[PDB]
Design a protein around this motif. Structure first.
Motif, short mmCIF file in Angstrom:
data_model
loop_
_atom_site.label_atom_id
_atom_site.label_comp_id
_atom_site.label_asym_id
_atom_site.label_seq_id
_atom_site.Cartn_x
_atom_site.Cartn_y
_atom_site.Cartn_z
N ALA A 104 -8.20 71.17 21.00
CA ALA A 104 -7.68 72.48 20.61
C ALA A 104 -7.08 73.22 21.80
O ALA A 104 -6.04 73.87 21.68
CB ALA A 104 -8.78 73.33 19.96
N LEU A 105 -7.72 73.11 22.97
CA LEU A 105 -7.17 73.75 24.17
C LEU A 105 -5.82 73.16 24.54
O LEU A 105 -4.91 73.87 24.99
CB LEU A 105 -8.15 73.59 25.34
CG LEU A 105 -7.73 74.24 26.66
CD1 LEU A 105 -7.21 75.64 26.45
CD2 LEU A 105 -8.90 74.24 27.63
N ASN A 107 -3.65 72.04 22.43
CA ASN A 107 -2.69 72.60 21.49
C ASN A 107 -2.36 74.05 21.83
O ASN A 107 -1.22 74.50 21.65
CB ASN A 107 -3.23 72.47 20.06
CG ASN A 107 -3.20 71.03 19.58
OD1 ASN A 107 -2.37 70.26 20.04
ND2 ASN A 107 -4.11 70.67 18.67
N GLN A 108 -3.34 74.78 22.36
CA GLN A 108 -3.09 76.16 22.77
C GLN A 108 -2.21 76.20 24.01
O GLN A 108 -1.37 77.10 24.15
CB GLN A 108 -4.41 76.88 23.01
CG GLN A 108 -4.23 78.33 23.42
CD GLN A 108 -5.55 79.07 23.51
OE1 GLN A 108 -6.59 78.57 23.06
NE2 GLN A 108 -5.51 80.27 24.05
N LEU A 109 -2.38 75.25 24.93
CA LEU A 109 -1.58 75.24 26.14
C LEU A 109 -0.19 74.66 25.91
O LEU A 109 0.75 75.02 26.63
CB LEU A 109 -2.29 74.45 27.24
CG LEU A 109 -3.62 75.01 27.74
CD1 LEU A 109 -4.28 74.03 28.71
CD2 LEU A 109 -3.38 76.35 28.42
N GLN A 112 3.02 76.89 26.13
CA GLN A 112 3.29 77.39 27.48
C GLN A 112 3.85 76.31 28.38
O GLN A 112 4.62 76.60 29.30
CB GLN A 112 2.02 77.96 28.13
CG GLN A 112 1.11 78.78 27.22
CD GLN A 112 -0.06 79.38 27.99
OE1 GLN A 112 -0.33 79.01 29.14
NE2 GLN A 112 -0.75 80.33 27.36
N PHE B 121 -12.58 77.46 18.98
CA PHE B 121 -11.39 78.29 18.92
C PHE B 121 -10.22 77.53 18.33
O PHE B 121 -10.05 76.34 18.59
CB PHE B 121 -11.04 78.81 20.30
CG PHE B 121 -12.09 79.73 20.84
CD1 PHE B 121 -12.02 81.08 20.58
CD2 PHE B 121 -13.19 79.23 21.53
CE1 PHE B 121 -13.00 81.94 21.02
CE2 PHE B 121 -14.18 80.08 21.97
CZ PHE B 121 -14.08 81.43 21.73
N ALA B 123 -6.11 76.80 17.81
CA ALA B 123 -5.04 76.59 18.76
C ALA B 123 -4.37 77.89 19.18
O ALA B 123 -3.72 77.92 20.23
CB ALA B 123 -4.00 75.63 18.18
N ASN B 124 -4.47 78.95 18.37
CA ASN B 124 -3.89 80.24 18.74
C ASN B 124 -4.85 81.11 19.54
O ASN B 124 -4.52 82.26 19.85
CB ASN B 124 -3.42 81.01 17.49
CG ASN B 124 -4.56 81.39 16.56
OD1 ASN B 124 -5.73 81.23 16.89
ND2 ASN B 124 -4.21 81.90 15.38
#
Ligand SMILES: [Cl-]
Ligand code: NA
Ligand SMILES: [Zn+2]
Ligand SMILES: [Zn+2]
Ligand SMILES: [Zn+2]
Ligand SMILES: [Zn+2]
Ligand SMILES: [Zn+2]
Ligand SMILES: [Zn+2]
Lengths: 231, 228, 231
Positions: A104-105, A107-109, A112, B121, B123-124
């Protein structure tokens, strides 16, 4: 090299009856062609992929090679962190209909970093093992988050039924002169994370990594010793 | 301000207090660390322990005296002593504790006791609600790696308040004071993501500065740009 | 100065029968107080405000001084660019129920500046004059965008029926030794924008500015000459 298969600008090396290493290259100033390695795993009637190539075009060539050499549908791909050598070809995976998974991290990064996020997010227990509902039908792929090291999001993969564990860019070969870590490295925890990878796959005898040829477990102990110097 | 033992409490809103505890750190001297106490109906929610179990028990005893509502849950914002040093005091009191899964994975290596529950958490960056049951006004956001890989942040719904923890420093800070577990590549984006997650917050609370305006976010992000 | 009025931390100077300058100060440790000026305009039975103070509390002091000394409702506020000295008190205006206006670009920049955006966006014709539909019931306020200078979004305001024009932070003291322009100044166009402000308000004899006392039109020509030295 003997055992290596050239296919366009990619190289493929069979590591085991059902496991291959894919290698793609990106030209970088001062270095010339920089290699990154990923894995291809045959699991019954389907193929699983670990990591893309640097680009969509190269990743399409991986899929082309799989069609030629294996001729089984690619069911899913897992990428091990949000750098270009691991996620640069996400678009080509998605265009081929392949289900993609990442931390998930990661995908969040990815946005950016200028990368496309995987379609699915993996989450991990406090002991580092993937939560199995976020990684359905992964077959022999055992996904382990060792802690921050090369990056905050780096994950690792063992292949059940083989002696192989994939340390990605966390683990460097036993003769590496440096860890090639940058500002997104966690130099406090890097050593413990490398050792936690070793401990998660204690029987693996072939350690595959992104930027070195496959090595013995000496790669793990050497990486952790070099990381000790960073704390 | 108000005092219970070695702890200082400052009311920030009708239902929100900042708790402040101190530890003498070799060289620096007495270092302050701030957390939050939130009254939410018939219960109290805590953000961050104090540096020690004893200090954290002092928070709990002030809550009982000044608020006299049970503490339903605590959330800790990363695996450093100023935020998780008092976990045992929370567990001794029967309080359910929550931390980023990564914080619970790091806690042993950091000499901390892990929280009982792991937050995960999307992805957002927003917490997966199933992992944060009954958090009431606490809106938990993971902004990305910065101060540490695992740092999380919390806004208080219905108030002007957002808590940046140790990620955000005040607008007069000279440096980020980050260590080897910081992510200097992503720090600035994570500070800006915190600001964007709580875009209307006008009081920014943080661990090692008194509450500030949104200038703390912008200043922290600008300082972080200079570490990239 | 003689004739000035104090309310808390703010100073008010009557400039004309229906115009006052408000002055607020920001403590720069080791430097003292940095003054910033704005305007208050009485227009019939309502008051119009140009620029907030540095902080919400200071801007509430402005509103209380207006209530106590003018005792007419504040109908609207216009802010002249997205810096703390002009928009730092937006929340105080909104809490009082005052309609707020700014250049659309100022509103777009406000979040990344840590400011609160105005409720309404002004837009401008190719000749710099505000599009009247975006500035309804502005009364004597004539809003002009002179082009990039101090910032890309800086706007200027003339007061119909007076000799007063407000140059904001674009126009500097005629005794200034430098422009004090930062990374967001447009040094290629600054001089032309200052001159455009002068040409938009050709009869204005009192030039009000953010960081010095009201000046003559020499403030415009001197500012443009200072900017010429940077092209
Ligand atoms: Cl990259
Ligand atoms: Na404001
Ligand atoms: Zn990498
Ligand atoms: Zn790599
Ligand atoms: Zn910390
Ligand atoms: Zn801290
Ligand atoms: Zn300005
Ligand atoms: Zn100014």
């Amino acid at each position: 090299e003997t055992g290596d298969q050239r296919f366009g600008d990619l190289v493929f090396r069979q590591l085991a009856p059902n496991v291959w290493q894919h290698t793609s290259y990106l030209d970088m100033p001062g270095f010339g062609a920089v290699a990154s390695n990923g894995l291809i795993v045959r699991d019954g009637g389907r193929v699983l992929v670990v990591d893309t190539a640097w680009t969509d075009d190269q990743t399409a060539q991986i899929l082309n090679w799989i069609k030629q050499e294996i001729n089984l549908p690619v069911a899913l791909a897992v990428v091990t962190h949000a750098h270009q050598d691991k996620m640069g070809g996400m678009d080509a995976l998605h265009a081929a209909g392949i289900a993609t998974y990442a931390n998930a991290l990661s995908n969040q990064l990815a946005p950016q970093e200028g990368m496309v996020a995987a379609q699915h997010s993996l989450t991990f227990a406090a002991n580092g093992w993937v939560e199995p509902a976020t990684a359905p039908n992964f077959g022999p792929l055992k996904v382990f988050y060792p802690g921050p090291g090369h990056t905050s999001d780096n994950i690792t993969v063992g292949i059940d039924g083989t002696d192989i564990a994939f340390g990605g860019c966390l683990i460097r070969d036993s003769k590496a002169k440096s860890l090639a870590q940058l500002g997104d490295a966690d130099t406090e925890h890097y050593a413990a994370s490398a050792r936690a990878f070793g401990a998660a796959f204690p029987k693996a005898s072939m350690i595959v990594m992104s930027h070195s040829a496959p090595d013995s477990r000496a790669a793990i102990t050497h990486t952790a010793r070099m990381a000790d110097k960073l704390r």
